[PDB]
Amino acid sequence: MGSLTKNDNLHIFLVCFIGQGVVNPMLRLGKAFASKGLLVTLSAPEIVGREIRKANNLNDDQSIKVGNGMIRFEFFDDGWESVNGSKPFDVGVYINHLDQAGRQKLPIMLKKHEESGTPVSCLILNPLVPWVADVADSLQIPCATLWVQSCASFSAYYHYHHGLVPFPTESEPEIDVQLPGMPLLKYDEVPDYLHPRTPYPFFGTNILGQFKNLSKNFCILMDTFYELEHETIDSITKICPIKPIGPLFKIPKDPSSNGITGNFMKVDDCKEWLDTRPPSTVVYVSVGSVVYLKQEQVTEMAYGILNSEVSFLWVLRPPSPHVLPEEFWEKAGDRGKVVQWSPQEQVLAHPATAAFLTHCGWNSTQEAISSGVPVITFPQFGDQVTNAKFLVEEFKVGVRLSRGELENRIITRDEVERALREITSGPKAEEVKENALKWKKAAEETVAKGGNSERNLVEFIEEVARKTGSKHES
Amino acid sequence: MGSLTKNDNLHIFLVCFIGQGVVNPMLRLGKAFASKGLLVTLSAPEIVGREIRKANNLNDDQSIKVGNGMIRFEFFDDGWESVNGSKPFDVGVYINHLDQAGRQKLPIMLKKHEESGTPVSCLILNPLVPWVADVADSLQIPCATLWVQSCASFSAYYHYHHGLVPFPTESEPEIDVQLPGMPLLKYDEVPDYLHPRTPYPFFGTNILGQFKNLSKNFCILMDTFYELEHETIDSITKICPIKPIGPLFKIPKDPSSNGITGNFMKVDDCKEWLDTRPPSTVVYVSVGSVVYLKQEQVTEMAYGILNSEVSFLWVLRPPSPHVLPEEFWEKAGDRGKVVQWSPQEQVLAHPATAAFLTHCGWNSTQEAISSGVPVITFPQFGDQVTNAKFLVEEFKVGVRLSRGELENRIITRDEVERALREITSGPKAEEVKENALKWKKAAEETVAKGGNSERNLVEFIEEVARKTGSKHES
Ligand SMILES: O=c1ccn([C@@H]2O[C@H](COP(=O)(O)OP(=O)(O)O)[C@@H](O)[C@H]2O)c(=O)[nH]1
Ligand SMILES: O=c1ccn([C@@H]2O[C@H](COP(=O)(O)OP(=O)(O)O)[C@@H](O)[C@H]2O)c(=O)[nH]1
Fold first, then answer.
1. Hey, are the CB atoms on A299 and B199 less than 8 Å from each other?
2. Superfamily of domain B277-425
């Protein structure tokens, strides 16, 4: 191999987009790198940097030490407030703006790190900023992308963008889709951003932008694990350099980096009330922050919860409706608790928790899998309808409530009551609970030393080290 | 009459509920009283007082001088944050809480004003705090209520609560309702909070609480004017002591009190862009802050606006979606402006404004009438469907777009385009514009010296003065 003529650290430079859905997985990846001694720069537009500085207490240089590793923050000015003015935020307009502004700002940052003696070893982007890979390719800087949805969802978008398999069109809106290494998907089980009936076609186009220059990333980091989607991963690896490294939230947390958070919203305290509950009795209900439920759907949920008589912890976050029935609060004093934002990981790990009524976002899908908590699937849009199909039919840890908002119907209180009673007692409840405990074990092993996800991460670091030549001068 | 043996001022004590929809009309009434030399106390729960102190710059005693009159603020602790805790806000829960807390706090405030030499002469409440009239009656303190919807809407709720006329029920959901002095209302033209199909039955119950003890108010102040609803007012006055004093926003504003505002949201600047527009060309589009439009409806609005080719000023306020088509912004550079919160009164008074696409809330309905601006009716829920029927069929200043969200259908872009083109040219556009200019004149006269609304206000002040005996000691 040759005698050592240099002993440089590596410098990982992550580039975020907007919102907690990108910052948190990106920040979790950066904390893993910093615990292994690498210098990590979390970079983001200034509109994100305002929320990061407000949520945390960053010092004058905005950096924390983790051994010889480090997590530092470098926010760049996207010029958005000056250009956008009084207009309401439009993510379709913004993503194009960040493309132009990012291509101007990133080379300046990278050139400065080169002059300052801290050259960037690897850029890591996400699907909504694929221009990072263009700048990386032009500078001969290795780059990788962090896919934060399931591998099933990746395979759907890949085959759609490349036209490798017939998808539902306006002429045939209801044909099934058979993807390699996947179960057969119904027309409404494909990530419905890609379906012609979607009200959000722009969300699909934005995700599809990752695939136009995907081959510029030498590695596709995935927030999933091999045991969970082994058949889909086997089929995709033959085409793309994907490497499952998830669940990102289950990687061992280093205490010297646990002070940093990517969550921007206040967290209500659920631990105190959960501790008073008998084990495996509370049904945790949450649709996240992006889902906005109509009043009529909330009412049927309240009556279903009330008629089911189950104990519950309901995350009912309003915008800036929603009134619950009066009879609900008469009985809620003994049975349930209603909050606006819960500590979901802590809640799913509590011994009082029995099930998770969820909208089936991929983070929640993985957190339920990793916690051994069975689910009631209540998908709304996007890849949720896909995650819901896997939770119930493939992972076999779930009970179905709805098929997504494109079904265009209110889920009645009788449907809510039946699903709640089914996940809490009877033969189906025992089956999905047992399967969920086998997924909890598999998730805890893949991130442990020697696990599939842990090995792929160290392999990525070593591959970066080889490309950088961190121990051989030139 | 007798020799004068005292020379006291009056003390008007207004009690608000929550939100700008109550604070602003209440504050406008208080400013009118203070310009006529009366001491005015604007009272509200502390959760409102936080927004009032943040929006304004109140001194240590929180009072402004207007001649010998005065506007002062006295916020009381409703104990809500301690009781509610981590629960999301529920107006159904809150209104009952404010009932219990209000009945405890108001007598303490009133008793203190009595001991401090500033006894309250008249209490003025609103329909969502009718317990004020109970406390006023027990203390022999005159009280009046401020009805902030149309007289047509009052007559609907009055006859419903008293069962004087058959309304739509679950058995007969589609029968018409004939109210005295009113045009025939279709089943979906009754304020739909009262219809069995409403998703918000609690909003109707809350308003109906005003009528259970309405007869304790010696006067019912109305934010309408006689010329506008003369036939309905004639029929109601025979039963109830109503006195139209509106439009409240068109009462002459005193400069020494114009610094106080009841609006809590930031105001984008539209005057600069409107000044560059040729006269009577811009279609102002706004659904207020309470209406939350789905993405699919926003898309059709954008394409209708774009295909209509009209100039526009669109108030598109998102919660804390909503993405507009890319083709929209290519053409919006020359034709339109999109903001999050506009100065609506200033916008409706600008000579460039041509029409108002509105959700037909009563404040917006009156502001369009008072400004001489024709409307496209786009009602959502509540009394809006009633205001929309009057705007188009009775006031004859409007063009109909939809019949409310209970119709349960997306208004297509072709319907948006047809309505936009109809209000901006052709014979209907000339007719509704001419009628709107006749309502502008009638509105400006009723608030001027000698007008119907102005006389009813001075008559109310004199009646308070007689009950108080402000010039004769005992
Ligand atoms: O009350 C809540 C709801 C959600 N979450 C977290 O927020 C993220 C949302 O995940 P998901 O991908 O399902 O939501 P989406 O992308 O659909 O908004 C997850 O990490 C959850 O654990 C949380 O901490 N508290
Ligand atoms: O962009 C906007 C929208 C509304 N308004 C004002 O807010 C009030 C809302 O009136 P309305 O009763 O129609 O609304 P709602 O009660 O339905 O929310 C009116 O005084 C409007 O002039 C405003 O100043 N700017």
1. yes
2. Glycogen Phosphorylase B; (3.40.50.2000)
